[PDB]
UniProtKB/Swiss-Prot annotation:
It is found in: Nucleus, Nucleolus; Nucleus, Nucleoplasm. Endothelial cells. This is DNA topoisomerase 1. Sumoylated. Sumoylation plays a role in partitioning TOP1 between nucleoli and nucleoplasm. Levels are dramatically increased on camptothecin (CPT) treatment. Monomer. Interacts with ERCC6. Interacts with TPRN; TPRN interacts with a number of DNA damage response proteins, is recruited to sites of DNA damage and may play a role in DNA damage repair. (Microbial infection) Interacts with SV40 Large T antigen; this interactions allows viral DNA replication. There is a cross-link at residues 3, 135, 347, 488, 500 (Glycyl lysine isopeptide (Lys-Gly) (interchain with G-Cter in SUMO2)). Residues 230-548 form the Topo IB-type catalytic domain. The modification N6-acetyllysine is found at residue 79. GO terms for biological process: animal organ regeneration; cellular response to luteinizing hormone stimulus; chromatin remodeling; chromosome segregation; circadian regulation of gene expression; circadian rhythm; DNA replication; DNA topological change. The gene is TOP1. Its EC number is 5.6.2.1. The chain holds residues 202 to 765 of 765 of the full protein.
DNA sequence: AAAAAGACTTAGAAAAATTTTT
DNA sequence: AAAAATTTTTCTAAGTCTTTTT
């Protein structure tokens, strides 16, 4: 059981009518280091204050990671650690390199190993304590039901792990108290703050979806506590997301033949945005918001391209005209491509590239803000991200219908599905030998069992009784079980091998549901509980003849 | 119109949990 | 009977997009 797609449209603007919960689970108080776990600075044994010893542990735990080998990290870490230090220590500890965490490191490594092998009997209780935490704070009451909360556990204090070349990595993540926690609820039983505390602010805003919010010290940005992907306040928007990408599917031809004329505009921004959009569409390039310089890791999207991320080569690789992309994309993923394009864009690109130093914005007089405004102008609620959802649902849908072999069995049909998924990861780009010794092992185990039926075949030929035919048939199914078993490992092998370098985000699930249904493939084999619990609506309201 | 704050979605990377190899 | 290997779950950083306001 669960709503809700069989439900009556909540209007825009209203998120909920009733909202009540039990607040966020804070990080358990810091347990001070045991006596025989010491920290020496310069070989000199030291016992740090609890606030300083806390931070020390953070580094002690990552004393086996690449992060702690990098300057930016170590530079930011110490400075912040210096702040959590009493005048006593402050004066003494002047540099990080002189500190010795190796003992504290070994300790938590022991702790981890110790918790790796505890009495199974007790393990159940940590799964129990966990479960009770789930039962008590993991759920909430929105409107008329008990929807699950996603990240009900507050963010523990640690060391900010900046992906890529982040000038902030290593900085101290403060322990968030209730005095920082903002609460959202409706007529609801306000959750009491931990004995002796007070919330930052208890507000009732039904124009947003979050339950708890606080500002993080590292970037100031606000962190939210939201509901499970299975919830309606999330599903409603997910079902709507793909529908918007389906709305686009219609007028895509109009929009395509539209921005193709916008290349001839008597205005820069228009002539510019048209080229930008051409990329977002053709290469599933992300919008590309303007980042803070020196406050974040420097990456770029489509709008935020600089002239140094591209190069134009009239003739290259023999065709024609080529645009060489080279830049770091999202989670510092380096995007590098030479893309043969139309002449109009080539000529248009060079125009945006006269009298400018590499450090200048390629698409100036242009930003995501404008580009998206122009988008919700043509089609309702249309944005840049939508284009990727369309491009690679459509592509998946087409891939299976041309990969899936109608007459094959389940495991072989399952691989057809996975194979399509790999092909989908081509436009967006990407996201043994112990096996063969069990494959080849059972490969003979099959022929040496097909041999039983071989000799049992000659039995019935001249002994045409009946109980003999029962033995012949009992080896037939025995060979089939090995025929089955084999194909499962033969599939796994080529599958695992195929994979070298969207499933959770850009793919309309309904596409899969319709495929799974028409080819009689149980959804359990394609989706785990995480997946079908969230894709509940699509698993339900999708006939075998659904097309994007 | 423009920018900064605020809200919401995407996703990589780790941690737990599960099956499977030694 | 750990250990090694996959495959789910949790986590939270990194984007997009919207709302709010200078």
């Amino acid at each position: 059981k669960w709503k809700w797609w069989e439900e009556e449209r909540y209007p825009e603007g209203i998120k909920w009518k009733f909202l009540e919960h039990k607040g966020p689970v804070f990080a358990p108080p810091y347990e001070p280091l045991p006596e025989n776990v010491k920290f020496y600075y310069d070989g000199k044994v030291m016992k740090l204050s609890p606030k300083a010893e806390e931070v020390a542990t953070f580094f002690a735990k990552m004393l086996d990671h690449e992060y702690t080998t990098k300057e930016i990290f170590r530079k930011n870490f110490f400075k912040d650690w210096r702040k959590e230090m009493t005048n006593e220590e402050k004066n003494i500890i002047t540099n990080l390199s002189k500190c010795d965490f190796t003992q504290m490191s070994q300790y938590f490594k022991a702790q981890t190993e110790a918790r790796k092998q505890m009495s199974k009997e007790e393990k159940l209780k940590i799964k129990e304590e966990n479960e009770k935490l789930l039962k008590e704070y993991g759920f909430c009451i929105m409107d008329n039901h008990k929807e699950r909360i996603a990240n009900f556990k507050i963010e523990p204090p640690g060391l900010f792990r900046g992906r890529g070349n982040h000038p902030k990595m290593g900085m101290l993540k403060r322990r968030i108290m209730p005095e920082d926690i903002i609460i959202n609820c409706s007529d609801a039983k306000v959750p009491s703050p931990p004995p002796g505390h007070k919330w930052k602010e208890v507000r009732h805003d039904n124009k947003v979806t979050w339950l708890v919010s606080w500002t993080e010290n590292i970037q100031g940005s606000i962190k939210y506590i939201m509901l499970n992907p299975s919830s309606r306040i999330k599903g409603e928007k997910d079902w709507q997301k793909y529908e918007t990408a389906r709305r686009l599917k219609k007028c895509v031809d109009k929009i395509r033949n539209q921005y193709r004329e916008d290349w001839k505009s008597k205005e820069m921004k228009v002539r510019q945005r048209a080229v930008a959009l051409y990329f977002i569409d053709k290469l599933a390039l992300r919008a590309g918001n303007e980042k803070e310089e020196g406050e974040t890791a420097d990456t770029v999207g489509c709008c935020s391209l600089r002239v140094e991320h591209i190069n134009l080569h009239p003739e290259l690789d023999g065709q024609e005209y080529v645009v060489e992309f080279d830049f770091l994309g999202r989670d510092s993923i380096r995007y590098y491509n030479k893309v043969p394009v139309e002449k109009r864009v080539f000529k248009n690109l060079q125009l945006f590239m006269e009298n400018k130093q590499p450090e200048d914005d390629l698409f100036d007089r242009l930003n995501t803000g404008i580009l998206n405004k122009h988008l919700q102008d043509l089609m309702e609620g249309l944005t840049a991200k939508v284009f990727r959802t369309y491009n690679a649902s459509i592509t998946l849908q087409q891939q299976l219908k041309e990969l899936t072999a109608p007459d094959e069995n389940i495991p072989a049909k399952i691989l057809s599905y996975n194979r399509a998924n790999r092909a989908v990861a081509i436009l967006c780009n990407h996201q043994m030998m112990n096996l063969q010794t069990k494959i080849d092992a059972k490969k003979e185990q099959l022929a040496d069992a097909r041999r039983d039926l071989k000799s049992a075949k000659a039995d019935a030929k001249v002994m045409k009784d009946a109980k003999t035919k029962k033995v012949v048939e009992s080896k037939k199914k025995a060979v089939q079980r090995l025929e089955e078993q084999l194909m499962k490992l033969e599939v796994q092998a080529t599958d695992r091998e195929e994979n070298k370098q969207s499933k959770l985000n850009f793919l309309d699930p309904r596409i899969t549901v319709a495929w799974c249904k028409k080819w009689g493939v149980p959804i359990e084999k394609i989706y785990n509980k995480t997946q079908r619990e969230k894709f509940a609506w699509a698993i339900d309201m999708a006939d075998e003849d659904y097309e994007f």
